[PDB]
Symmetry: C3
Subunit: 668 residues, 3 copies
C-alpha cells in the first residue's frame, strides 16, 4: 500500500522538499529530504518497549555519507568506519533532538541520516536536521518538536543564510543554530574575533530564518503524520517521595556544601546507598527511588542559587575558579602547557611536522588536506573512573572540533608558518568544561612551541538556573551546574572578539536578554582568564623548538635545477620518499629541505650533491678498458695507461682516482 | 598416545586423504583433509550441555585462509591475516548444509573451524573444506544425520565439469557448488551465463551423483576412526497431551489463520492459547501446577505450523491472501538521485531496494590479494541491510554475514550480463541499499541492479531479474511458493532463489531442510520460479528495458590529445618512471597508443586538462646563468635594454628569445 | 600548591617522582621521570567490591608526541594499541598482581602514559617504578611496593638499565621486578648464556633495585595519604575446622587414584556425601574445599607421589616430531609434547616483505616476523576469533627465544615469517612454539645457529620444603608458587621467564630449578635432532629464488637511473629486490620464476 505525501517550501536561496510514504515504510518514521541537489533519507526507528528502570535515554543518531552521493567510488581498499565528519554531524544532529524528547522517555530510538546526493551549494548538516525533525514528527514518537535549524554566515556586515562551503570562504562567521518555534535549542559556531553583539544577532537571525521550515515540517506532519504514541513517564508515589525527602534532604543540603568534588560525590553516594539499604530493610522502585533522589538534588542545588546563597564550591555567580598555568611541561615535546582551572585540568602538547605529517581527509567536500589537526581526549581517571581505553568517543571528537575552531582564527597561516601542527589536549581532571581548558591550554602550548599566533585565546563555560521570571547566570560552570542547570553556554575568543560560540539549552523560553547578559559575564570571565594566562606566556616565542623539524638549506646552480626535479618531477619525489624529507626548491637556485632529523637532513643533501672537476681526487669504479681505463667518477674520464701505477705496466678488470686535467684525464 | 588413522581415495582427478588422531586431538573431532596439494585442518567442538533454555541451535563455522598456505607473507602492513569476504562467504557456504543435518532439538553450541594449511591452484579450498567438516563432525560423535559431501560442477562444450579450478572456470559457463548426503541434496550455490533450468538442474544432479564416492569414503573413515557417538535423545513427547491440544485448538486455529490482518490475528491465537491454557488447567486443578504452559507452548507452536502448512497444501490462500503462484506488487523507478551516475528504486511488496551505480576509472579498481591473488576487480558490488529495513534498531559496524552472503548472491546474478572491460572501459560500483525487507531483498538487489546499470548507460547484455521461492512438503504432497514473505521461509521445508534473464538462469541458490526432494519436484519448482522471474522482468522493462544510449554527464570521460611519436620516449620516460608520476599526480589513467595518441581517463575535466598540461609542457612569459637565458619551460644586447648598460616570445645553437 | 617531588639517582640516570599537581581526581597518580623519559602513571581503585577473581587492568600507552612525532596513520591519531603497548601492559601487570592481598576483589585500573621519551632511557622501568609508586599513594591495599631494573651483559660485566643502542652490544636483555624482600617476575632474552650468568643477572637486578624501592617507599611518606580500611574477608576457622575433620582423609585418598574419571567421581562424590550431611547441622564452602583440595595435591607431590597424570617431578611428557608436514609451505614442523601440540610454518620472502614498525624506538624494519595463534579448539572450547593479549604475550616470549639463533640478514638474505598454530594446549604451548620453530626454520633451510628448545617448569614450596615440576600441565599452574619457563640451546640459554607468588625462594634452589630445566631442555633437544639435526643445505624450491645476470658496467646507471628512480620502478613493477655489484652481476630476488624473469625483461630493454 503506497501512499506518497510530499511537502515543498522555499528556504532562502534553495527549494526544500520532504517526501514520505515511498521509501523505508517499515521505519517508525522516514523522510526523503531534498534541498537543492543534496538528498538525505532520514528514518527513525523506536522500540515500543523500554528496559524497566532505565537511567538514560538511548537515542542513537547515525549520519552516514555515501560516496555515490558525489559520484565517486570509495578510495581506500567500500565506505569504512565513520569519518570524523560523520561522527560530528551525528553529534550535531543528536544535540538539538535530545532535549525535545520528553523527560523520562527511555525507549531506545535510532535516527539514521544517509546522504544520497550531495550538492556543493547545499551543505548536508542543515537538511539532515530538517529531516530528523520531520521523521521523528511523522513517527508519532513522543516529541515536543518540531525543530528547525539554520546556518548563518557573516560578510560585509550582513548575514548569510545557509551559506555554501565556498561562500563561507568569504565569511567571518560560521554558525549553525537549531531550535523550536519558540526557542533556541543548540548553537555551534566558529568566527574570527567577532563581537558578542554580532554573535547574538546571528543566533537570532537564524532562529527567525528557520521558522519557515519549522512551519513546513509542522504541516508536513499534519498531512502525513502517523498517530501519536500514547505514552507516559514512570510514575512517582509521593508517599515514597516524602519519605525520601525527610530522610535525605538535610544530608544532601550539606553534602552539596562540600567544596572538593570527590569528597562531595562520595558523601552523596553514601546517602544514596543508605537510602537503598533503608528501603530494602523494608527493579522499577530503585529507578523510581533514583528519580526522586535526583529531583531532590536538583531542587537543592537550584534553590540555593535562585535565593542568592553561595554556590556549591562557594563562589558567587560571577567568579571564575582559581587558575594555575604552566608551560614547558614536558622535556621532549615541541610545546606544552598545563592549564588548571579549579578541578578541570588540561595538559596540552604541541607537535610540529613537515608536509609528510599533514593529514589527508576524504569525504563529500572532496579530498582536502589539513595542516592543523586538533585532538582532544578524556581518560576515565580524570573523572575518577574505570573504563575502556579504546578509540576516541563522539564527544572527544566533538570537543576536539570545538576547541580547534576556537583556536583556528589565531593559528598562523601556511605562509608565515610552513609547518604542520598537531595539538593534543589531555584532560587529567574534569569538574567542568574541560573543553574550554583545551583552548586555553592549547593557546599556551602553541606559543610555548613557537607557533606565531595572532593573539592569546581563552574560553569559558556558562549556564543558568531559571524558574519562571527569575534567573541567575552562572560563570565558569562546574559539572553539577551543567547537569542540574538549565543550559551549558560555551564562549571562546580573544580580547578583541569571540572565536567560537557553543550552546546547549535544556529549557525553553530563554530570551535574548538572558543570552545578552551571558555573553559578557562570559566576556569578563574570558578577559579574567586571559590576564592570568598572559602572566606566564603573553606572546609566541620568537623561535621554534630544537627537536622541531627544521629546514636544511643549500644553494644550487639554477641550471642544475633541470636535474633534481627530474623529468616529470620523478627524481625529487624519489628523494622525498627515500629520506622522508619534504624538499622545497626556489626556481632559482636555493633548496630548502624539511628534516625531522639531522640524520635525514644530512641524508637529504648527500642525495642532492649527487645530481650536482677539478680533481679534487674522486673515487670511482672502472667500466671500460682499452689500448687505458675509463673509470666512473660522477661522469667518466680516462685513466691513461701512462698514468696507471708506474713502473711501466690488467691492473684491473672492472671493479674498483685523481683528476689531473680537463679540455677529463685521471691518474693513480 | 597417538593412533593415526588414514583414508585415501580418488575424487575425480584428485587424490583425497583424510587423517585423524594426529593433530587437534582435544577437539571434539578433527580432520586433516588433503585434496591435491590443498590441505585443511577441520575441527569441531561442541559444549556437552545446552544452556538453561535454548530456543535455537548455536552453530558457528570459521573458515580462515593462512597466507603461508600460498607461500606468501601477508600484505597487510601489520602483516597478519579481519576475516575477508571470501573467508566469511566460505564460512557461510560450509555452515548452510551442516544445519539441517543436526537433529531437531539439538541445542548444544558447536564451533567448526576450517583452516587452509596449503593451497593448490588445481584444487579450490571450499570443496575439501566441506568434506573435512563432514569428517570432523562424523568423527566427533556429536549427534548428526550425515554425512555430506560436496562438488563443484562446471559446464563447457555442453558437458559437466567436476571440481574445476579457477583457471578451468575461466572457460566455464557455470560455477555451481552442491552439497548433499547420500540420499539428499542439501544446498546449492551457483552463477551461470544464461543457462537453461535443465542444465542447472542437471548440474546439481551431476554433482550429487559425483560426490557419492567422497561421502562413502567419509562414512567408512568415520566407521573406522570415529569416537564414541554421543548418547543423546530429543525431548520426550506426551502423545496424550499432543492429541489433546490438537483436538482442542485445531478448529479455532484454522479460523484464526483466516485473518489476514496481523495484529488482529495474533490476538486470536493468543486467545486460543489462553483458552487452551485454561482448559488444561481445569483438567487438573487440585493437582499441583501440573500446567507447565511451556510444553503446551511448544506443542501449540508446532500445531500452528502444521495447520498453516496444511491450509496452503489444501489450496487455502497464504497468510497475506496470495495463492502459491502470485508475485507481490512491483514498482520500478530509475534516476531517483540527482548526483548518482545511475539509480533505481525497486519495490516488491514490502521488499525494497535503492540501488545506485557509480562509474569510475582504472584508478578505482579494487585490488584483491589472497590464495589465487594479485587480482583486480573492475566490477564492485556492495550490499547494505540497515536495521530500519526490518523496522528495528541495530548497530552500524561493518558488513554483516548476510550482507556478504546476500550481496554476493546478487552479484553473481548480475555479473553474467555485465559488459566486458574491452567493450565498456569503466570500473563499476553498484551499491544496494535495502530500505524495506520482508521478502527476499537480495533478489530485489538483483532487479534494482539491472535497472541501475542501464539507467547509468552501462551496456548490460540484457535485463536480469530474480525471485525467491519456498516449498512446503508434507508426505507425498508438496506446494511451491512464489515470492515468499519473511515469516514464510520457516513455513517451508526448502527455500531457493533463482535469478536470470529472459533467456536463462544467471544464478540459482538452494537450501533444503528435508529429504525426498526429487529431481521432479525441483524441475517443477524451477519452472514456477521461471514464470515468476519473467513476470517481474516484464514489469521492470516497462520503465527501462534497455541500457541508456550514453553515460551520465557526471561520469568519468576520456580526454584525447595528439603527440609527437618521437617524443613518446620523453613522456613515458626512462624506465617508465615519468608516465607513472603523471598518473599518481593527476590521478588519471594515461594510455598512450603507439603513435601518436594519448587517451586520458578523467573523473572531472580539471583532472583531465591537468594531465594534458604535464604531458604538453613535457613535449611542446617566464624566468639566468650578460645576455638573458631565463629558460622558463623546463636568451634574448639590444632588447634587454636599448638604453644599453641591473634588472617566452620564442622563435648546437638554440638562441631565443624569452623576455 | 603541592606538588611533592622526590628525587633520587638510579645508576647513570636521575629519577624523579612527583604528585599533587596533576591527575588529582584519580585514586592516586604520579609523574615519573627518568632522564628525559616521562610517564604519567595513575591508579583508580573502584569504590566498592562486587566475584572471586581480580579485576586488574593495566594500560600502558605511548603518545607519539613524546617522541616529537605525528602519528603515521591516516587519521593522524593513536587508536590501536601497538604490540609494544600490549606487551608492556602485560609486563607491568605481572609483578603487581601477586602483590595485591589475598581476597581483594576491588577493581583496579592502572594507566601509564608516556609523555616524553629519551633515547637513553627505555620506557619499561620508569613505568613500573611509577606503577609501584602510583599504587603507593592510592592507599589501595598492597603488600608492596616494588621496583624494576634491566640487566645487560657486555664483556663479562653486568649493565644496569641499559639503553636500546647499548643493548646492541649486550649479550643479555633482562627485566626483573621485585619487592625489597623477594623477586617477583623476570623476562629475558640472551644469546646462549649460562644459567649462572642469567641467575646472576636476576640477583644483580634485584640488588641494584633497592635504591628505587627505597626512593619509592620514602616518596609515599612525604606525600601519600593513609591506607584504605580493609582486611581479609570473614575468615571462618569454624568453617575450616569441620571441613577437614570431615574432608581430608576421604579426599587425600581420592587423589591417589588414577588420571580423572575415578577422580571427578569420588571427589564429586565427596562434594555430595559432605554436601548431604552439612545441612543436618554459601559457595564459601566451595572455596575452602578447593583450597584444601589444593593443599592435598601440593602435599602429595612433596612426598614424591605421582603427579596428577601419574608422572614424577622430573619426567618430560612423550615427544613426537615431524618436519615438512605441509606440501606448499617453505618450511613446516609439528611438535607434540604430551597434550600440548604446535604446528609451525616457515615462509621466506624478498626484502619487499619486511615488517615496518613505527614507534618510540624510532622507525625500523624487521626481517624476522614471528606470529602465535591460540585457537579455542586446542583447549576443547568454543570461542571468538585481532590476536588477544596472551597470544602476543606467549608469542613474544617464543620469538625472543628463537631470535638469537636466527641468521643475520647478510648471512641469509631472506625475510622470514614464522607462524605457530597451537592445535593442543595443556602445559606451556609458548615453549612448544619454540621447539616447533627450530625444526620449521631448519626444514625450510634457514641456517639457524643451533637447534633451540624450551621447557615450562613449576615449583611447589611449602615452608622450607619444595619440589621442582618439569613440563607442567595447565592444571599444575595453580598448584605452583612459581611458574617459570626456560628455553635455550645445547650450549646456552636463549630465553628466561619467571613469575613468583610466595617469598623465601632462595638462590640455592632456582639454581637447581634452572638445571632440571636444562635437563628437560637437553632431553627435548635430543629427541628433536634425530628428526631434523642441522638446517637443510637448501632453501625450498617454492621459496623465492635469486636470478643472477651480468650487464655492461657502463650501463649500471641505465638501470639505477637518475637519483635512483629507474631502479625503484623495476622493483615496484615486478616486486623484486634488486642489487647491482659495483660493476658486475645482478642478483634478483624473486617470488616466482615469472616475476623474476619479469625483472630481466625490464633490465634488458634498458640495456
Amino acid at each position: 500500500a503506497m501512499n506518497k505525501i510530499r511537502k515543498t517550501f522555499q528556504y532562502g536561496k534553495h527549494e526544500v522538499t520532504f517526501e514520505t510514504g515511498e521509501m523505508a515504510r517499515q521505519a517508525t518514521g522516514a523522510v526523503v529530504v531534498r534541498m537543492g541537489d543534496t538528498v538525505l533519507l532520514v528514518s527513525v526507528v523506536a522500540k515500543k518497549e523500554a528496559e524497566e528502570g532505565r537511567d538514560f535515554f538511548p537515542l542513537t543518531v547515525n549520519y552516514q555519507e555515501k560516496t555515490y552521493a558525489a559520484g565517486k567510488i570509495p578510495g581506500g581498499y567500500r565506505e569504512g568506519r565513520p569519518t570524523e565528519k560523520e561522527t560530528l554531524t551525528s553529534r550535531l544532529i543528536d544535540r538539538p533532538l535530545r532535549p525535545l524528547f520528553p523527560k523520562g522517555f527511555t525507549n531506545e530510538v535510532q535516527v539514521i541520516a544517509t546522504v544520497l546526493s550531495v550538492d556543493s551549494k547545499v551543505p548536508t548538516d542543515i537538511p539532515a536536521i530538517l529531516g530528523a525533525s520531520a521523521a521523528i514528527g511523522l513517527s508519532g514518537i513522543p516529541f515536543n518538536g518540531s525543530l528547525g535549524a539554520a546556518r548563518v554566515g557573516y560578510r560585509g556586515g550582513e548575514y548569510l543564510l545557509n551559506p555554501s562551503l565556498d561562500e563561507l570562504k568569504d565569511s567571518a562567521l560560521d554558525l549553525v543554530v537549531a531550535g523550536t518555534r519558540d526557542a533556541v535549542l543548540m548553537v555551534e559556531s566558529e568566527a574570527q574575533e567577532l563581537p558578542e553583539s554580532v554573535m547574538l544577532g546571528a543566533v537570532l537571525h537564524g532562529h527567525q530564518a528557520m521558522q519557515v521550515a519549522i512551519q513546513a515540517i509542522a504541516e508536513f506532519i499534519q498531512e502525513a503524520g502517523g498517530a501519536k504514541w500514547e505514552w507516559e513517564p514512570p510514575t512517582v508515589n509521593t508517599a515514597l517521595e516524602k519519605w525520601v525527602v525527610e530522610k535525605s534532604e538535610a544530608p544532601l543540603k550539606k553534602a552539596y556544601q562540600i567544596q572538593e568534588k570527590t569528597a562531595r560525590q562520595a558523601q552523596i553516594q553514601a546517602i544514596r546507598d543508605q537510602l537503598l539499604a533503608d528501603r530494602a530493610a523494608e527493579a522499577v522502585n530503585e529507578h523510581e527511588l533514583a528519580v526522586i533522589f535526583h529531583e531532590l538534588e536538583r531542587r537543592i542545588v537550584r534553590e540555593q542559587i535562585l535565593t542568592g546563597q553561595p554556590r556549591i564550591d562557594g563562589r558567587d555567580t560571577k567568579t571564575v575558579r582559581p587558575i594555575t598555568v604552566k608551560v614547558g611541561v614536558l622535556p621532549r615535546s615541541h610545546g606544552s602547557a598545563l592549564f588548571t582551572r579549579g578541578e578541570t585540568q588540561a595538559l596540552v602538547v604541541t607537535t610540529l611536522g613537515t608536509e609528510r605529517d599533514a593529514q589527508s581527509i576524504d569525504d563529500l567536500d572532496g579530498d582536502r588536506q589539513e595542516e592543523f589537526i586538533f585532538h582532544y581526549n578524556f581518560p576515565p581517571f580524570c573523572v575518577g573512573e574505570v573504563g575502556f581505553m579504546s578509540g576516541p568517543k563522539r564527544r572527544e571528537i566533538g570537543h576536539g572540533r570545538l576547541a580547534k575552531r576556537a583556536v583556528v582564527p589565531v593559528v598562523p597561516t601556511l605562509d608565515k608558518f610552513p609547518y604542520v601542527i598537531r595539538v593534543v589536549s589531555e584532560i587529567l581532571e574534569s569538574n567542568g568544561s574541560s573543553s574550554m581548558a583545551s583552548v586555553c591550554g592549547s593557546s599556551l602550548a602553541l606559543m610555548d612551541a613557537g607557533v606565531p599566533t595572532k593573539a592569546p585565546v581563552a574560553g569559558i563555560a556558562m549556564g543558568l538556573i531559571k524558574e519562571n521570571d527569575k534567573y541567575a547566570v552562572l560563570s565558569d560552570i562546574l559539572g553539577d551546574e551543567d547537569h542540574l542547570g538549565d543550559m551549558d553556554f560555551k564562549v571562546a575568543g580573544t580580547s578583541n572578539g569571540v572565536t567560537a560560540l557553543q550552546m546547549d539549552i535544556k529549557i525553553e523560553g530563554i530570551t535574548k536578554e538572558i543570552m545578552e547578559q551571558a555573553l559578557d559575564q562570559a566576556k569578563e570571565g574570558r578577559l579574567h582568564i586571559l590576564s592570568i594566562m598572559n602572566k606566564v606566556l603573553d606572546k609566541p616565542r620568537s623561535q621554534v623548538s630544537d627537536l622541531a623539524p627544521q629546514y636544511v638549506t643549500m644553494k644550487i646552480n639554477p641550471e642544475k635545477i633541470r636535474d633534481v626535479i627530474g623529468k616529470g618531477g620523478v627524481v625529487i619525489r624519489e628523494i622525498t620518499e627515500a629520506t622522508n624529507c619534504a624538499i622545497d626548491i626556489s626556481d632559482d637556485g636555493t633548496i630548502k629541505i624539511a628534516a625531522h632529523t639531522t640524520e635525514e637532513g644530512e641524508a637529504a643533501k648527500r642525495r642532492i650533491e649527487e645530481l650536482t672537476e677539478l680533481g679534487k681526487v674522486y673515487e670511482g669504479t672502472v667500466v671500460k678498458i682499452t689500448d687505458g681505463a675509463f673509470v666512473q667518477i660522477l661522469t667518466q674520464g680516462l685513466v691513461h695507461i701512462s698514468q696507471i701505477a708506474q713502473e711501466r705496466v690488467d691492473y684491473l678488470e672492472e671493479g674498483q682516482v685523481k683528476v689531473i686535467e680537463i679540455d677529463v684525464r685521471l691518474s693513480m
